[PDB]
Structure formats: structure tokens, C-alpha cells
């Protein structure tokens, strides 16, 4: 698999900057044109800058709202695709996917897609709520901003049977609960753990279901 | 400039039927001196990336499998797919690259499928939670169908409707369903001064509301 | 040169 690691992005304040830095592998980075494409959360895909080949003397093309703020920008030696966001609105907020896309053909191969958030307000560690009683188990995840956490069930390991529900937001603080369906026999006698993670504030937190 | 505008915006089917959608462009997308349609669909599986499936209209990406199958010139182009696997799942764009670009309205396809019954678990609020001072008492109802349902919170015999937050999640690819949470969330206070909690789900799928209970 | 390459 061709890969884009998009390193960059998070929580910013309004009229900051940020630079993200999409950093792909796996075909002729130098002889294609790549593209950033975001989503604001919920709603559908915008594309927002372009950055034609070394061949066509780097030319760029930028959406209208993104124009005359954002700077889309490549080195092709280190195969880094960057692109400056300057005087960052709240509409900016969103997944920004780093997309590779051939001249004349489609947008070939879609990245992971790094987070950025726009907002006068801080980050919090979320609070890890075990929510003891097949078996249903759940983990409330309680308060933090900006998002997202990754909820997952000892390492990650735990993948069949799990409820992680999309945090909805109240009074300028998320929520996010989980659960896992977990046979009987498999505990108290085992370790159920809950860890969850909170890049914005390196909240790793990995509260073992009991009781 | 170019204005994409698909329809249906929502599409419901059961596995294995033809479904057609649609996008209709604002200005022309057939390039002269290339005699291509510029317009691609996209499709993106709920919590993933954008996946190329269709190019210069009728072209299909590479590893795209058969079922899909691009359509039109001009303005009117149109998506089809034959055996709707369940996988089929995903909000489905029409980008266009004739200039620049314009990305489609969407058309979430939902999956018909045979009506579950909900499978309500509750839990009172976290010990650890309580040292704080506030009591979060969540209620799931996991794999159902239809999506259609209702949680009333309802403590000692009052029905509480306030302070509940709730989400549902996408329907499952695996297994076509929904599911949701609702969270009733309190005070270590007034928690104590309340005994009985009982979470009500009335669904399609029973004349009886279902309903799960914990008192302290 | 004359040859058509679409940049989008």
C-alpha cells in the first residue's frame, strides 16, 4: 500500500496559524500532483488546495475561501507535502485528507485525514468512567475538548463486539461512551481494561473494568 | 461556477437489488479537445477516508470491483451498482475536474433489512465518578432495526426528560444495525435523593416497551 | 506542446 502520514493539526485559536505535513510513500511522489481535501465534521468533502509537479513549475490552485490565507507547498526530496494555514476561522475546524491525484485522471489515493480544530477555548483530559454491570460492559469517557479520543478495549486487542458511540457534545465539553459485549466466562475471571487516549493532552488513561 | 447536485439524497435497499443514483452537473463537464467527462464518485465508509470508485465518468479505478458501474456525458451522470452487499454501506459523492473541483451533495445509502429488537443493558453511576460529586447513569440499546426508537428515563415513577444525552452510531456493515446511549447524567446529591432508576425503550419491533431497571 | 494535459 502507497501511504500518506499526515503528521500536524489540533486545537488552535482563531486568526493562529498551523502547518500540517503530509509526508507520503509508495509511488514517484516527485512526478505527481498532489491535492488537500477537507470535511468539516458531519458535513461532505471540500478541496482546498492544489499543487502541481516540479514538471509545471509547482503551480498551485487554492479553492476561494481558503484563497489568499492557506499555502500549499512541496519538497520533493523528503516527499513532504506541507500547507500553511494562516488567519484560521471557526469553519476551518475539520479532518483535513491529504490526497495524491495525477493530472487530468482522479484522486487516486486518499490519506488518513489529521484533525484541526479552531476555538478560543482549551483542552481537558477526558474522565474515564468504568461502567460495570454475554455480558455488557461499558466506558464513559466524560468532559474533554477538543476532540477526538480513541477508545479501544485491552490494547486494542478487544475488536468483535464493541459500541464506541460518536461523542456529542454539551456545554463546550464532549462525551463519549463504549460498549463491549463480553461472553460470560470471560470475566471478572480475565482483565476487561478500557484505554483511552487523548492526543491533545496525552491523556492515556486505561481504567480496568471491576467489580 | 460548476454546482454538483445528486439525488436521492437518501436511499434505502436490501442486499442484492439494483440501486441508481444520480448527479447532474451545473455547466457542461465533456472536455473537447479530450472527449473525457470529467466527474468521479467517490464513496466513504462511515469513519474512513474517501474511496476512489469511478473516474472520467465510466472509467473504474483500479481493484474497483464490477458491481459498480459509472455512467453519462454532459451533465447527467449516474451511479449504479448491481447485489448490494452489505459492505455497500457509505455516503456516496460526484467530485468533478473539468475546473477545479466541486464535490456532490452525498447520498447516504441505508440497508433494509430484517427488524431487530433492541437489547437494553443499564449501569448506575460510576463508583469512582460519585468521589467527584455527579452521577452519570447510562443506558445502551444496542443492534435494532429500524433506527426509529425511544429511551425515557424514569426515576422512582417521575419521567425525567432533561439532562439526557444521547447518541445513536452508524448502521453496522457487519451486521446492518444501530445502536445507541442514553446518559441520564445527576449529582451524588440528587442521586441519593432518588432511589429506583428504570431505562423505557419502546421500539417497532414490540407492543411492550422493553425496559431495564437498577434501584439502589 | 500542443498536446493537452488537464491540470484538475
Redesign the interface.
Known amino acids: 500500500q502507497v501511504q500518506l502520514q499526515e503528521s500536524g493539526g489540533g486545537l488552535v485559536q482563531p486568526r493562529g496559524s498551523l502547518k500540517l505535513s503530509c509526508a507520503a510513500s509508495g509511488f514517484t511522489f516527485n512526478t505527481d500532483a498532489m491535492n488537500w481535501?477537507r470535511q468539516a465534521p458531519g458535513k461532505?468533502?471540500?478541496?482546498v488546495a492544489?499543487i502541481?509537479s516540479k514538471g509545471?513549475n509547482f503551480?498551485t490552485?487554492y479553492?476561494d475561501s481558503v484563497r489568499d490565507r492557506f499555502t500549499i507547498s512541496r519538497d520533493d526530496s523528503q516527499s513532504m507535502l506541507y500547507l500553511q494555514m494562516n488567519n484560521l476561522k471557526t469553519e476551518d475546524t475539520g479532518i483535513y485528507?491529504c490526497v495524491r491525484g495525477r493530472?487530468?485522471?482522479?484522486?487516486?489515493y486518499?490519506?488518513?485525514?489529521t484533525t484541526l480544530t479552531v476555538s478560543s477555548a482549551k483542552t481537558t483530559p477526558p474522565?474515564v468512567?468504568?461502567?460495570?454491570?454475554m455480558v455488557?460492559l461499558?466506558c464513559?469517557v466524560?468532559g474533554y475538548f477538543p476532540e477526538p479520543v480513541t477508545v479501544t478495549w485491552n490494547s486494542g486487542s478487544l475488536s468483535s463486539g464493541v459500541?464506541?458511540?460518536?461523542?456529542?457534545l454539551?456545554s463546550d465539553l464532549y462525551?463519549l461512551?463504549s460498549?463491549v459485549?463480553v461472553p460470560s466466562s470471560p470475566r471478572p475471571s480475565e482483565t476487561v481494561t478500557c484505554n483511552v487516549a487523548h492526543p491533545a493532552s496525552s491523556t492515556k488513561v486505561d481504567?480496568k473494568i471491576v467489580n | 461556477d460548476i454546482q454538483l447536485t445528486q439525488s436521492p439524497s437518501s436511499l434505502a435497499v436490501s442486499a442484492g437489488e439494483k440501486v441508481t443514483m444520480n448527479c447532474k452537473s451545473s455547466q457542461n463537464l465533456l472536455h473537447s479537445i479530450t472527449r473525457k467527462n470529467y466527474l468521479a464518485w467517490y464513496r466513504q465508509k462511515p469513519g474512513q477516508s474517501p474511496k476512489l470508485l469511478i473516474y472520467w465518468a465510466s472509467t473504474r479505478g483500479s481493484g474497483v470491483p464490477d458491481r459498480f458501474t459509472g455512467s453519462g456525458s454532459g451533465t447527467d451522470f449516474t451511479l449504479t451498482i448491481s447485489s448490494v452487499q452489505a459492505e455497500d454501506l457509505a455516503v456516496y459523492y460526484c467530485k468533478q475536474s473539468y475546473n477545479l473541483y466541486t464535490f456532490g451533495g452525498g447520498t447516504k445509502l441505508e440497508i433494509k433489512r430484517a427488524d431487530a429488537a433492541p437489547t437494553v443493558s443499564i449501569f448506575p453511576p460510576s463508583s469512582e465518578q460519585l468521589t467527584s460529586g455527579g452521577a452519570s447513569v447510562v443506558c445502551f440499546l444496542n443492534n435494532f432495526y429500524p433506527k426509529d426508537i425511544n429511551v425515557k428515563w424514569k426515576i422512582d415513577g417521575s419521567e425525567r426528560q432533561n439532562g439526557v444525552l444521547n447518541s445513536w452510531t452508524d448502521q453496522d456493515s457487519k451486521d446492518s444495525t444501530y445502536s445507541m446511549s442514553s446518559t441520564l447524567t445527576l449529582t451524588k446529591d440528587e442521586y441519593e435523593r432518588h432511589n429506583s432508576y428504570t431505562c423505557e425503550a419502546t421500539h417497532k419491533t414490540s407492543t411492550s416497551p422493553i425496559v431495564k431497571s437498577f434501584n439502589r | 506542446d500542443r498536446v493537452y494535459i488537464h491540470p484538475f
Open positions: 481535501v461532505g468533502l471540500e478541496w492544489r502541481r509545471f503551480a490552485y479553492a485528507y493530472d487530468g485522471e482522479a484522486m487516486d486518499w490519506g488518513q485525514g474522565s468512567y468504568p461502567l460495570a454491570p455488557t461499558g464513559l466524560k459500541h464506541t458511540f460518536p461523542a456529542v454539551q462525551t461512551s460498549s459485549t481504567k
